[PDB]
Amino acid sequence: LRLSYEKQDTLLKLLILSMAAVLSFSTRLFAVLRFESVIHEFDPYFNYRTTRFLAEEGFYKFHNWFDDRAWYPLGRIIGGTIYPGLMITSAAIYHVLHFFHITIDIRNVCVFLAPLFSSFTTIVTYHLTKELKDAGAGLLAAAMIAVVPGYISRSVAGSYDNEGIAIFCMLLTYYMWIKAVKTGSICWAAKCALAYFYMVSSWGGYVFLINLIPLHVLVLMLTGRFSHRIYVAYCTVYCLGTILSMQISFVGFQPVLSSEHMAAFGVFGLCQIHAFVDYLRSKLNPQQFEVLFKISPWTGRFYSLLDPSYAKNNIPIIASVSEHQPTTWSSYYFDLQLLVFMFPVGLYYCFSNLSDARIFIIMYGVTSMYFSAVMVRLMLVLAPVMCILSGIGVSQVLSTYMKNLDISKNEVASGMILVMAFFLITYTFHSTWVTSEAYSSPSIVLSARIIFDDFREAYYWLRHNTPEDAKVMSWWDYGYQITAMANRTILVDNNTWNNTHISRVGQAMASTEEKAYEIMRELDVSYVLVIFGGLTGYSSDDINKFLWMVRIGGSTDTGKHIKENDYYTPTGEFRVDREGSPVLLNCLMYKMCYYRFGQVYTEAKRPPGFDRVRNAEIGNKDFELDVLEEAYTTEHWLVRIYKVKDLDNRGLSRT
Amino acid sequence: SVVSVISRFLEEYLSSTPQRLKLLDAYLLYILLTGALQFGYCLLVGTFPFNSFLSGFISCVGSFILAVCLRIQINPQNKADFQGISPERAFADFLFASTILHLVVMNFVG
Amino acid sequence: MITDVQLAIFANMLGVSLFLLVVLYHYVAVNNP
Amino acid sequence: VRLDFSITKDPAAEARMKVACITEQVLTLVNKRIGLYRHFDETVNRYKQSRDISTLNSGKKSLETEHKALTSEIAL
Amino acid sequence: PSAMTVYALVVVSYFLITGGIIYDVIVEPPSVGSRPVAFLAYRVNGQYIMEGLASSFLFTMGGLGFIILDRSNAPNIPKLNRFLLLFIGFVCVLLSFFMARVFMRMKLPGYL
Amino acid sequence: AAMLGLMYVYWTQLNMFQTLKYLAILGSVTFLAGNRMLAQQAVKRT
Ligand SMILES: CC(=O)N[C@H]1[C@H](O[C@H]2[C@H](O)[C@@H](NC(C)=O)[C@@H](OP(=O)(O)OP(=O)(O)OC/C=C(\C)CC/C=C(/C)CC/C=C(/C)CC/C=C(/C)CC/C=C(/C)CC/C=C(/C)CC/C=C(/C)CCC=C(C)C)O[C@@H]2CO)O[C@H](CO)[C@@H](O[C@@H]2O[C@H](CO[C@H]3O[C@H](CO[C@H]4O[C@H](CO)[C@@H](O)[C@H](O)[C@@H]4O)[C@@H](O)[C@H](O)[C@@H]3O)[C@@H](O)[C@H](O[C@H]3O[C@H](CO)[C@@H](O)[C@H](O)[C@@H]3O[C@H]3O[C@H](CO)[C@@H](O)[C@H](O)[C@@H]3O[C@H]3O[C@H](CO)[C@@H](O)[C@H](O[C@H]4O[C@H](CO)[C@@H](O)[C@H](O[C@H]5O[C@H](CO)[C@@H](O)[C@H](O)[C@H]5O[C@H]5O[C@H](CO)[C@@H](O)[C@H](O)[C@H]5O)[C@H]4O)[C@@H]3O)[C@@H]2O)[C@@H]1O
Ligand SMILES: CCCCCCCCCCCCCC(=O)O[C@H](COC(=O)CCCCCCCCCC)COP(=O)(O)OCC[N+](C)(C)C
Ligand SMILES: CCCCCCCCCCCCCC(=O)O[C@H](COC(=O)CCCCCCCCCC)COP(=O)(O)OCC[N+](C)(C)C
Ligand SMILES: *[C@@H]1O[C@H](CO)[C@@H](O[C@@H]2O[C@H](CO)[C@@H](O)[C@H](O)[C@H]2NC(C)=O)[C@H](O)[C@H]1NC(C)=O
Ligand SMILES: Cc1cnc(NC(=O)c2cc(S(=O)(=O)N(C)C)ccc2N2CCCC2)s1
Ligand SMILES: [Mn+2]
């Protein structure tokens, strides 16, 4: 009342912003209230085990670092193969607290760093949208960003992966570029180069930034809107950004001799070839001017995003992961509700008033949408831009219907604000439900309250009851955990940087017992860890993914007898019952995944030796492993650890 | 046959251009020449140390581009696209960008 | 600690209040003198 | 806040600031004057005034109006 | 040129993409129910062609409705035409936002 | 001039953790003096 318009306005903007921030930080906090604060899934177990070694030992003792506890015979270098972004933002955030005598743990400032960086995303989004248009349509973006279900899936409290901290860097870089294009100041461009540098060091998806920018300038150059502002900004950002990007040891000399970063360069030369021509035309006349008138190819990984079928045909490892398939009508709406509708309206409102800044948002939305269409995992990029577009659209509708009200036809004018409020509420509800029920489930804690924590008990056993120089060999999926929890030297890791060693391990499985033993001697493997999952109903059994093992071991020069369409039955169906193919019933994988199993009564009224996951009886009821004596089998038979026997003493053929 | 126009253009650019702006062009030519020499020596011998030549060449392309940016902003004629960017706030910005560029060049070179 | 249900209810209430407040802010914005 | 860190000083920008500050002083003075005059008229003219307190209130209101006129002349 | 003639193309591509055309082409799903049931039982991302194109069309309507609404507000429009245009926009908005929700519930029983 | 000299003293001897602090100090001194001189110049130009 008595408060002036200024004070009221700013106190409302501040209130709403603070509330949005708290909302975002307190909605990705479900996996912690239910189960204790522990990092989850296959990747966050490596980033953690690296940030920890970078905390105690100074940065200079981590830039170069040879980890001889992964790919045992080979050994992988962690110093120059990983983007050191997350580890230096977490080490710094931990060191500052220690300097302030907070003395927090390194496993507690490393779990709550995704939600914290999803509380700074809100502010950056609010500004990135307070630039394209009025503050009025900026807040409406922040709150929607706070509770966007697709983004929340990759940034819950416990997912220490460079994917909930990458979006923040992308937004900051875009805000810097938008400011540079809007104003043209050298300083702003610089402050963008720096953001790109802090983004090329944390997220492997920085090719987007050196491919949307050239696209943006090309469009701002084909329609005839290329002024000196864009020229100055682009050139400065290019130079500084590329030189900064080359610093990182992992990137090396990629920006200058690769076909992924050839866009920026081409647009640079076509920028000059344009500015100079304009200058010449200004100082000349039509008549005289008329008179005068090694590089590597597209790497398969990034090429798979263009051709959506290249993966299936050629790369037999990128198609394995579930989250590598095209998105359906049931993923877009499930993760983004009411945003999908808002996207066309936001586009239309942009296309209505083209400007230097907007022609960038439209390009980003058009590209990101297609990239999300090809692969479900890319939904990271899509949700923020869609949210920004949604913010620019609902607000416009509200603004259009906010002036018609007599206080500021009346019934029709209200009908819109009321419908919009109802849609916003429905969106908040659906977002909370999606975060709660589904996108929040601990990976290593199979639960139905009954808790199955075998994935931890077996690793702890390994870590405590094996010689300090074991060689636990398991599928590349579990490499990150075994080295962070079991603390052994797993033969294959999750980076899959050698497609012959992994093929080797594949061959060692789904083969005759002899061949397997022979392959399990060159690498000096001792223990063997297979995730049975049959007795508990686990969906992702080792047998379930055993097709990938047979299809990635028989695709190299070393082994070809393992050809597919041989483990199948005459009718080509993968049945693991008594009528299955004889070779299948004899491979090392199955032989070590159903050993002394055709006796347990898994179900009330079923044949003794039943399998819950495949709903079929076992074929090889009783057999004795020749080389693999048993060593441990967890209470629920969820993870079985065997141990390769040594060469026979008397030199007999067996064992 | 096409030299008359070139000479006329140069003459024009030697009367219609204010001082304290030609000097910028001279320094720009200097950078363009040091870059040309660098590239020529690279072609003549090839590159054993790649990061050495690459960062002893960017350290010139970046400077050249910063100089051109300063000439653009300083130019009074081009004071419609840039609003509120006084010449002093352009020179200081150029100095800051140059400092970053040189620091990174020093870090990258051997 | 805090029951999951409690946190969900708090999230719902906060989100609804934040959206109503955003609408109110749009009304105040248009009404500028 | 106490650090200017500005290379170029523009007169119109500072003029707007000063005019807004003056308009704030004036609005506060008008609000205070209306509150005072109304309170004096309500607390001194209930049933008996004797033309003594009313004269003092009129003098105070004239002084306030004179100060507001001086501030308006200064801003003009 | 013709800046709008581009927004039309973009909207058409958006309709084709949000109907999972990439999924259809990559992994051909039979557009049939095994009495035919259009929607898949429980898979979060399992698209039959009928579930896809039909769901997408709804989103496109859920966008054109708003565009029609905002366009109607333009002044100097006869009341007879304005009323019809606003009616169409409201019907498209409400109908798309309810049909999509019902479709989602049907595809994934236990929703909300 | 000292800032540029440092750009050479960080080549031979120093590491990226001592050069940065020195720059953080010399640059600040350069910035404050520069700003003052630039303001004076701007006033004189008008
Ligand atoms: C499956 C697969 O693949 N995988 C993979 C993996 O993966 C992974 C990953 O990684 C991970 N990650 C991490 C981080 O970890 C994960 O990931 P994730 O999950 O995913 O996560 P993230 O990432 O984060 O996230 C993700 C997300 C996503 C991404 C998202 C996305 C989104 C988006 C959006 C995207 C986008 C897309 C796109 C496409 C874009 C687009 C856009 C748009 C818009 C569209 C549009 C379009 C367009 C185009 C546009 C257009 C536009 C326009 C405008 C138009 C245009 C216009 C125009 C005009 C144009 C123009 C034109 C022109 C210009 C023409 O996870 C995953 C999984 O798990 O990874 C891995 C890695 O690790 C990988 O692996 C790798 O690989 C590689 C390659 O490969 C190779 O190989 C192959 C095969 O074969 C072979 O191999 C095998 C096996 O191995 C065998 O067996 C066989 O036999 C054979 O042999 C081949 O083929 C190829 O070729 C290749 O070769 C490799 O390499 C690697 O390896 C490596 O590594 C390993 C481990 O690490 C190791 O072990 C090994 O050994 C190796 O190592 C190496 O390397 C390293 C690094 O690399 C290092 O460190 C080491 O040491 C070594 O090194 C060495 O060697 C090398 C060889 O190469 C060399 O090179 C080096 O050297 C270098 O370096 C160094 C350092 O480093 C240096 O030193 C040097 O330098 C030096 O020397 C030189 C000589 O010359 C000189 O020069 C210089 O100077 C020196 O320097 C020195 O020195 C001086 C005195 O002297 C001083 O001064 C200074 O200082 C110093 O420095 C250099 O050179 C050495 O030697 C592996 O393996 C896998 O694969
Ligand atoms: C999902 C994939 C679907 C593919 C769809 C591709 C569309 C994505 C490109 C988005 C770019 C939007 C920018 C844009 O459209 O600019 C508009 C319209 O003017 C033009 O832009 C004309 C050129 C349009 C294409 C320019 C880039 C082409 C592809 C980029 C490499 C500006 O037009 P104006 O120049 O403002 O209007 C003038 C028209 N007169 C009649 C007056 C002459
Ligand atoms: C927001 C922007 C900042 C984001 C920070 C993100 C962290 C990324 C750092 C990744 C490290 C890349 C590799 C690297 O830094 O090189 C290290 C030197 O190591 C370092 O110095 C790391 C310093 C990290 C902070 C740098 C601030 C960047 C400001 C640019 C002016 C090696 O340098 P030195 O080992 O010191 O060189 C020794 C020999 N010389 C003669 C060459 C001096
Ligand atoms: C994981 O196992 C390794 C192998 O023993 C442990 O590394 C040893 O750590 C102790 C620290 O008390 C050192 O004194 C030894 O020298 C290390 N071993 C070797 C071979 O160098 C490591 O500590 C274990 N990780 C834990 C316990 O967290
Ligand atoms: C089995 C796997 C699971 N996850 C994996 N990692 C990638 O697939 C991947 C990695 C990079 S990268 O930047 O790390 N590159 C190594 C420099 C880029 C793109 C990538 N994919 C995005 C779409 C197709 C390729 S492999
Ligand atoms: Mn990751």
mmCIF file of N, CA and C and ligand atoms in Angstrom, chain A residues 69 463 468 487-488, ligand 4:
data_model
loop_
_atom_site.group_PDB
_atom_site.id
_atom_site.type_symbol
_atom_site.label_atom_id
_atom_site.label_comp_id
_atom_site.label_asym_id
_atom_site.label_seq_id
_atom_site.Cartn_x
_atom_site.Cartn_y
_atom_site.Cartn_z
ATOM 1 N N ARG A 69 44.966 -49.550 -11.451
ATOM 2 C CA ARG A 69 43.925 -50.350 -10.819
ATOM 3 C C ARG A 69 42.704 -50.456 -11.723
ATOM 4 N N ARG A 463 36.500 -56.737 -0.806
ATOM 5 C CA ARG A 463 37.425 -55.775 -0.225
ATOM 6 C C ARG A 463 38.082 -56.274 1.054
ATOM 7 N N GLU A 468 45.545 -58.989 -1.465
ATOM 8 C CA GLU A 468 45.623 -57.579 -1.836
ATOM 9 C C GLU A 468 45.988 -57.367 -3.302
ATOM 10 N N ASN A 487 37.619 -52.336 -4.189
ATOM 11 C CA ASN A 487 39.008 -51.882 -4.123
ATOM 12 C C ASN A 487 39.972 -52.980 -4.574
ATOM 13 N N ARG A 488 39.628 -53.632 -5.683
ATOM 14 C CA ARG A 488 40.483 -54.586 -6.365
ATOM 15 C C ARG A 488 40.896 -53.998 -7.717
HETATM 16 C C1 LIG G 4 42.768 -50.435 -1.460
HETATM 17 O O1 LIG G 4 43.769 -51.438 -1.551
HETATM 18 C C2 LIG G 4 45.091 -50.901 -1.703
HETATM 19 C C3 LIG G 4 46.020 -52.079 -1.876
HETATM 20 O O2 LIG G 4 46.583 -52.482 -0.635
HETATM 21 C C4 LIG G 4 45.454 -50.026 -0.504
HETATM 22 O O3 LIG G 4 46.694 -49.390 -0.793
HETATM 23 C C5 LIG G 4 47.554 -49.387 0.359
HETATM 24 O O4 LIG G 4 47.270 -48.278 1.213
HETATM 25 C C6 LIG G 4 48.097 -48.216 2.384
HETATM 26 C C7 LIG G 4 47.592 -47.060 3.214
HETATM 27 O O5 LIG G 4 47.406 -47.438 4.571
HETATM 28 C C8 LIG G 4 49.556 -48.063 1.972
HETATM 29 O O6 LIG G 4 50.378 -48.058 3.133
HETATM 30 C C9 LIG G 4 49.960 -49.206 1.050
HETATM 31 O O7 LIG G 4 51.282 -48.997 0.571
HETATM 32 C C10 LIG G 4 49.000 -49.304 -0.132
HETATM 33 N N1 LIG G 4 49.330 -50.449 -0.965
HETATM 34 C C11 LIG G 4 50.261 -50.412 -1.923
HETATM 35 C C12 LIG G 4 50.472 -51.687 -2.683
HETATM 36 O O8 LIG G 4 50.907 -49.397 -2.163
HETATM 37 C C13 LIG G 4 44.385 -48.969 -0.254
HETATM 38 O O9 LIG G 4 44.633 -48.301 0.978
HETATM 39 C C14 LIG G 4 42.997 -49.602 -0.209
HETATM 40 N N2 LIG G 4 41.974 -48.579 -0.065
HETATM 41 C C15 LIG G 4 41.323 -48.345 1.079
HETATM 42 C C16 LIG G 4 41.702 -49.211 2.244
HETATM 43 O O10 LIG G 4 40.465 -47.473 1.171
#
